[PDB]
Design a protein around this nucleic acid. Sequence first.
RNA 1: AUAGGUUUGGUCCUAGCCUUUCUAUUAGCUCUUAGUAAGAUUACACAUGCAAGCAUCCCCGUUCCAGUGAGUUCACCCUCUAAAUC
Lengths: 116, 108, 107, 49, 162, 107, 184, 77, 50, 242
Amino acid sequence: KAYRGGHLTIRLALGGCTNRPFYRIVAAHNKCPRDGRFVEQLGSYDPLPNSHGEKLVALNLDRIRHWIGCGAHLSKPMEKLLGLAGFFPLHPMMITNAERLRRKRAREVLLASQKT
Amino acid sequence: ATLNQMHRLGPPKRPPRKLGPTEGRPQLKGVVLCTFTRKPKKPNSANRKCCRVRLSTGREAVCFIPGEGHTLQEHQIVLVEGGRTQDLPGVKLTVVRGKYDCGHVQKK
Amino acid sequence: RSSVHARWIVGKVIGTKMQKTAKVRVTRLVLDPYLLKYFNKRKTYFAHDALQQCTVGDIVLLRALPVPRAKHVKHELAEIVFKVGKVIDPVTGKPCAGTTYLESPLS
Amino acid sequence: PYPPLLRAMIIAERQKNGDTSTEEPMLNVQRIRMEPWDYPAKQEDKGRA
Amino acid sequence: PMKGRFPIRRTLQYLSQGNVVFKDSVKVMTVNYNTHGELGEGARKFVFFNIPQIQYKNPWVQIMMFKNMTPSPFLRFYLDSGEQVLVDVETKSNKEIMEHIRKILGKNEETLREEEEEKKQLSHPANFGPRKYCLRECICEVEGQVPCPSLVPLPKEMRGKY
Amino acid sequence: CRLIGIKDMYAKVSGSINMLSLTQGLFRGLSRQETHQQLADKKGLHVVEIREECGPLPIVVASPRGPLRKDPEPEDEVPDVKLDWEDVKTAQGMKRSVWSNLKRAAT
Amino acid sequence: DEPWKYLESEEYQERYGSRPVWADYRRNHKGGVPPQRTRKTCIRRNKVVGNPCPICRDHKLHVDFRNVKLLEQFVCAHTGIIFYAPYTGVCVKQHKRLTQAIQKARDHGLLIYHIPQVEPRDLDFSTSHGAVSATPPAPTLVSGDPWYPWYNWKQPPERELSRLRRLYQGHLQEESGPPPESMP
Amino acid sequence: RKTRHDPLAKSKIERVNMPPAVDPAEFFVLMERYQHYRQTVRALRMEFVSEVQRKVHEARAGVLAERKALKDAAEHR
Amino acid sequence: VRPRLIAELARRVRALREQLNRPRDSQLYAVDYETLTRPFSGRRLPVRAW
Amino acid sequence: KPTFMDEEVQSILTKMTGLNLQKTFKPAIQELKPPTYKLMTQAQLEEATRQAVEAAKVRLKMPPVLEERVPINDVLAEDKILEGTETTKYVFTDISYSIPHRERFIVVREPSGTLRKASWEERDRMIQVYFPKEGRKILTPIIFKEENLRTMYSQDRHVDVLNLCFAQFEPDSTEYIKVHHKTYEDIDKRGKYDLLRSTRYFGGMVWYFVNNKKIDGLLIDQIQRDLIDDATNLVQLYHVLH
RNA sequence: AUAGGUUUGGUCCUAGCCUUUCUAUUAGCUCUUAGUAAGAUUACACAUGCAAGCAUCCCCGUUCCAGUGAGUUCACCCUCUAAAUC
Ligand SMILES: [Mg+2]
Ligand SMILES: [Mg+2]
Ligand SMILES: [Zn+2]
């Protein structure tokens, strides 16, 4: 299909039931839908903890060196996972959300010390 | 047919034949016009209370009323179903009992 | 490189009844998916020439063009493989009929 | 420095070539510019409605 | 039964038993064979049996057959560059010429063995294909993960009745 | 086959299904059987197995009562046998009925 | 009360002997070909309806994983595959009990079965690679410095702070300084 | 979604869209994160497009591609 | 193949009722300065520009 | 100099591993295809026996005894920034095909903001949640426990355990080693030694023993049947190893 | 198809019809509770309400998603190459 504004973007895809999400990294064009087609299938993302504490994830990395090597953008939740993979720098937006609970903990230890 | 013959023909090639109830639909509604009686084919002898219905289409097809009694007269909406009635020689539709104006049978 | 598809073809001329082109009948072998025997499915390709070398009945090579040069002209007759009758028998290159040597070897 | 994995990866492969070469894996930065977000555009890239 | 004379030629296992697959630069193989020669029986049993096996493996090369156009049987090939190989076949069997092309214009087995891994890598094992392209549509369809809430009732850590 | 002693068997009767010509044609075929001891005796040659549970071992079945012929057999491959269409199209396995791959009782 | 004392005792050899359990039962159905989904329930909760299943007519045949020879009766001897339900004619609820307890007893090892001799995962057994050998660690990280010194709060001079007060005068928020580093 | 025309009804003719607030102790490091993140990523892009370019160069006119390309035109002749 | 004459033509007069009478810089960019509404656009302005 | 994969020390333990071809290629219990019929003369029988011994040798060449583990846990990145901010343990896997298996980068993240390096128990499991093959349930099956094993050595099942480890645990691990030696211990107590004679008998039984000086339990076997040079060409092998 | 019933006074053969199996919708009678899938028939008419906004204004985007099956050989491969992202 010929779209408008098209570029390849590395995105997540929902392949689950209700109350069991599963995310699936693919390379897809900008405009084709979430549960639509793609150009190449990448790693997977398990968003729920199984037995003995595990929220799994994959990264088919030597072709994301190719598919970002042809100049494809990414999505803001996708860079949350490559950056926390140590493949890419830790996301500064994730660093804010890392820090804005320390601020919540800078009023949590207050409300527990102003009390007791 | 030799080998050059069967390549010229190709595979087998068939249509269906959609039956009595128009273009192979399960049930069909209609309105009754006449409830008369028809006499069966040669091994059998009875007289079977079968109606005439114009369907949803507007086609009058003669139809069979199963069960002991019929109450239908001339304006009632009945829902016909397509089973051939084997001692009638061309009655192909039947009414389902307990529907849309015709109720169930009077059980003793 | 080129734009037309079938790059390299040998065929047979049917009719040269236009000017500086010939009508060439070529046969592939395609398989029946069921009957599983190979059958000559033909197709008709045009062939452009310069010298009007071909006559109606010869077996011709024809090479594809980088661009079609008409609506239907597609290849040029790059070589004429088997002449009508005057077939040079390609190993032992000398004139012959069907199966019999006109100019016999040991010449 | 490279991010923790490609920094870990490339030094391992040189160790598979046969030259040890224990220099730190540094990628250039000066070859990429630093225009912040109020650098202006050029007008024929845009188009008036 | 089957309707031929030698009816094993039409079985789709036979057509794969041929092994002579042509390089990318052969674009026409044209065969010419006598019909009643006592000396050319290999080029009669060539086109009788073997060239259906060739066409199933290089299915885009044009093959064409002529009957009484020449006293001696031959093959002639039409390469992409423009030269014409002239294989001769006279007083050979149909067996030697299934060996005389695979050593000339048949692909090297090194060049087909390296052609067999790349047909595998695009059917890569850890993709999650819809049971037609690859396995495991869910991660529930490997063990250890929380399994697909049609298969189990899932714990109360879900929404909706949380 | 329960009365003969046969425990595993595939058989399909095509054509007419008549209960007497079936059995008099059952006992006709099953009487004319090539035993493997008699498979040797006509040809003199040695009879083996190649099973799917064992390896490629040529495990022996029957040997002649006496001598053995020396020459290797004339192995003219892909033989002139009238092989049946309802079994080789099965071995390709495209066409399917809802009446073949079934789960019935224990015979 | 805890079987495997039944399959060798005297009510067994006076009922079945050398034949399998299912050698008298074969089912009642319509014409010809029997249905693929066998009846699921042999007994429903208080009583049994009609003909009972082979493992439902006896109340003294109960299946488990240590009933070694009874479970051998429902696997073909030279073909290791469990029979489908309409071969035996058992209820398929009892055949879910038989498709676990075979494998539950296959997984305990008290039933002999086949495993093919396999080929290894890799042709190389070399273990000197930078993920599996040792890794020369970071000249930042040996020193107590993380990566990339821009993570920790380089608090700006006040000139950049007051830049927004004349940009965003009607809307600001009030704060504290650099973070407290670790947690309880 | 909308299809150029449909009347953009009463809910959003005016809904005054005030923004969230600004974090100047962190925003003047958050602005200093992004120029330290957009520039480092833009260094990895030219690591990889040049990488992909050599992966095209090694199979077009590559040193073991040229040796293959002269091999076959010998083993042909 | 269908030649699409009225589709081509109504393009070339759509450009002609765009090229010849393109609306100039003023009558879209006038602002009613009290409600921050403009003629010919309907859209008022973001929060950092009041 | 110890060096099990030397060229001559195989050829003796390959030789004292028996040929005994009917025990080797028993018919496996599987779903059989109906047997195929070849008819081969005494000239072409002998080329088909020798093929079945040419194909028998290649089933007698794997494994080696393979260098008991070291547990690799070094940390590459340990950021003091995350540390208990967002939990549950991400595990990162490089996937392609054209990298070999021990050359693979599998990385875990921790709720405390470290980057741990996926200890040896996890990495081969993380291969098998992703790169599946024959048998191989990715967790520990309930056969390999000491009680569930002690049912199994009763049933003349030692090849059946030695062929279970060859899927489940790679022979450089410890859970291959701690349940192979759990088997060859119990092979010696009540010595039942003629059971392992032509599947991985080049080193699984003897190269355990020649390190562990319990070879008196293996030479009684070499005088019970006949096995004459079989005895003497390993009592020499005590001195040239130790 | 592992096939079975039916031409006749009967047999054999050719033969169609039907039965047995599976799936999908409607209809009857009937129905305890959770979970996941799935859910106008009609390209027939539509009351209503919601479905494109973001943003230091410009632009961009509402040409995408989502829908339906009216029509129909504009879907796949090669050549040449234009918009789009690097
Ligand atoms: Mg409407
Ligand atoms: Mg239509
Ligand atoms: Zn699911």
